[PDB]
Amino acid sequence: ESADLRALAKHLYDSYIKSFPLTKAKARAILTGKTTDKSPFVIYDMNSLMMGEDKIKFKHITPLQEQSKEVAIRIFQGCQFRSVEAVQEITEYAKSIPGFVNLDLNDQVTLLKYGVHEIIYTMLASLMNKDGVLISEGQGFMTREFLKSLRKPFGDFMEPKFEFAVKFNALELDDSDLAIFIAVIILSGDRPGLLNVKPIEDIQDNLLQALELQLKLNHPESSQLFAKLLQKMTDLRQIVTEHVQLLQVIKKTETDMSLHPLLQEIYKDL
Amino acid sequence: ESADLRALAKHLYDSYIKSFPLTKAKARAILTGKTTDKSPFVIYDMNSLMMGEDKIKFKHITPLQEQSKEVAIRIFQGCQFRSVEAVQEITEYAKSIPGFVNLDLNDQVTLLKYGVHEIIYTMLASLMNKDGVLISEGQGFMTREFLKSLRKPFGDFMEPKFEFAVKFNALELDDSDLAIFIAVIILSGDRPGLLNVKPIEDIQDNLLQALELQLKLNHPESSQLFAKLLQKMTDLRQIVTEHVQLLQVIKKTETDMSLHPLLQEIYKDL
Ligand SMILES: CCCCCCCN(CCc1ccc(OC(C)(C)C(=O)O)cc1)c1nc2ccccc2o1
């Protein structure tokens, strides 16, 4: 019954709204403008970064970075901080997915551990455009050029994410669409170490059925969007792989720096 | 009109048969036996191998390999020759894909350059089962274990292809399905360096439409098979990468071993 599917899509869309502060609809409003109601502080260079805490609230540093916590290392940890935060928000969302809590406990933990990086980059696209990404609830905007101009190692971290986002965003999906896609990502029966794949693939198929009808009704003129969206999951696993090895190099040259137990434990070159 | 899509499915299925001498239908008939006509000889060790160049035709060496062109390398040269052979067959098939020969000569070259190996591993699955792989037109069968017992580097070239084949074969696709799927693989507009992405994507969208109707008609009871097959496109990408780096190692350990020009050209670590 398409009613059961249209019911699942609304449920998911609702949990999605209650779990993620900044939505794509909202974020797009901020990136395009046409209003004064909400204009974020812009970081486009070293100096503008310092004022970061001047106008926004960051537990990072403002003054000299070289001698007291380098600039790149400080922006990196800010990314890490927001990430462990997003992980908790994704974990709560997963709980609203029909059937998720009923799965073996170890399976739930395995699905979140391997699916978190893929969902973060997916959702990150919602906050990106060709020239930059929104930060701290959308109160900020960090330039694509400023990021691409960081120290030897930290210089090529976000550029690949920007390359993916520009393409992903070309599909013009909205929150109701993304709410189901993220659910599909989480219920992946191919993660390493799963104990009972069946019930997981059973739920994903129900989510795939809901995603297809959603795209059919929401994008009548976008032929084969479903197929195209699934093809993007390939670029996500690639980005995540490339991210692991780039994260390793950081773990070899930046000894003074650390990696929170979050983006460490759920990390075994997954 | 689903009638136009069925015509495309027929066309492609027809060219596939004409382009690939060893179809999956023939391969499964040789593998599952119950035959007397097509029983393959089996290579499971250095001895059966020596006898293999007797019954089956093998332009290689029979006696000693060590100081006389090692056996591991002798087998490696065997795959190399078979791959160049497959590239030529895949190239012929491609030209039958409507619209393909009408694209910029550069894009044609690029689509073939990055799609060939993804196709080779897909079709290679047709000749595999958990225990081994058919060789030399089906006259032979080389064991998974023998292959995994070769020299340090060459010993792990095939294992991931096998691990892929066991999962991919569980979908139970037949030649008519594979004909469309391989067409879809080749016409991937997300290949590095393509000059004209749009004419390529219009072709792929039409092929995906064809694949979707084909799977629904051919596998009425296989829920979401279309989406399951597309996700398989990610396991192929990994296979290639893994292969490339392993190939880089050989390039250094054996400065006396040569690579066929056609394979060296498609390869640029991509
Ligand atoms: C219709 C039958 C077609 C042939 C079936 C068997 C194919 N096969 C290994 C498959 C293979 C294909 C490509 C590969 O990637 C290479 C390494 C080529 C690359 O792209 O670098 C790697 C492995 C094989 N191995 C043999 C050794 C000895 C004798 C015969 C053999 O046959």
From the alpha carbon of B80, which atom of ligand 1 is closest? Answer: 18
SS3 state of residue A69:
coil
Please indicate if any CB of chain A lies within 8 Å of the CB of B118.
Answer: no
Q: How many CA atoms lie within 13 A of B210 on its CB side?
A: 27
Whether ligand 1 lies within 6 angstroms of the CB of B116 is answered as no
Distances (CA, A) of B33 to B27, B37, B38, B264: 10, 9, 8, 38
Q: A42 - beta bridge partners?
A: A141
Interface contact A208, partner B, CB < 8 A: yes
Q: Does A233 touch chain B (CB under 8 A)?
A: yes
Q: Which atom of ligand 1 is nearest to the CA of B74?
A: 28
Interface-testing mutation among B4, B224, B226, B240, with chain A (most A C-beta atoms within 10 A): B224
Whether the CA torsion B42, B135, B251, B69 is positive or negative: it is: positive
Q: Identify which of B51, B77, B82, B251 to mutate to test ligand 1's pocket (most ligand atoms within 8 A of the CB).
A: B82
Residue of A nearest to B211 (CA): A227
Minimal Cα–Cα distance from A11 to chain B, Å?
Answer: 22
Three-class SS state of A68: coil
In this complex, which of B205, B223, B231 lies closest to A230 when CB atoms are compared? B231
How near does any CA of chain A get to the CA of B245, in Å? Answer: 14
Which residues have C-beta within 8 Å of that of residue B97, sequence separation ≥ 6? B12, B15, B183, B186, B187, B203, B207
Task: Say yes or no: B224 contacts chain A, CB-CB below 8 A.
Answer: yes
Residue type present at position B19 = S
And the tokens for A33?
Answer: 């403008």
* B79 in contact with ligand 1, CB cutoff 6 A: yes
Whether the CB-CB separation of A143 and A131 falls below 8 Å is answered with: yes
Mutate to test the interface with B, among A209, A225, A226, A230 (most CBs of B within 10 A): A230
- Using the beta-carbon criterion (under 8 Å), do A223 and B205 form an inter-chain contact? yes
Out of B190, B227, B234, whose CB is closest to A208?
B227
CA distance B244 to chain A (A): 15
The reported resolution of this PDB entry, expressed in Å, is 2.3
* Nearest CA-CA distance, residue A61 and chain B, Å: 40
The residue contributing the CA closest to ligand 1 atom 25 is B79
What residues form DSSP beta bridges with A132? A129, A143
Structural domains in chain A?
1-270 (1.10.565.10)
- Tell me which of B79, B164, B259 to substitute to probe ligand 1's pocket, judged by most ligand atoms within 8 Å of the beta carbon: B79
- Element of type H or E holding A135: strand A132-135
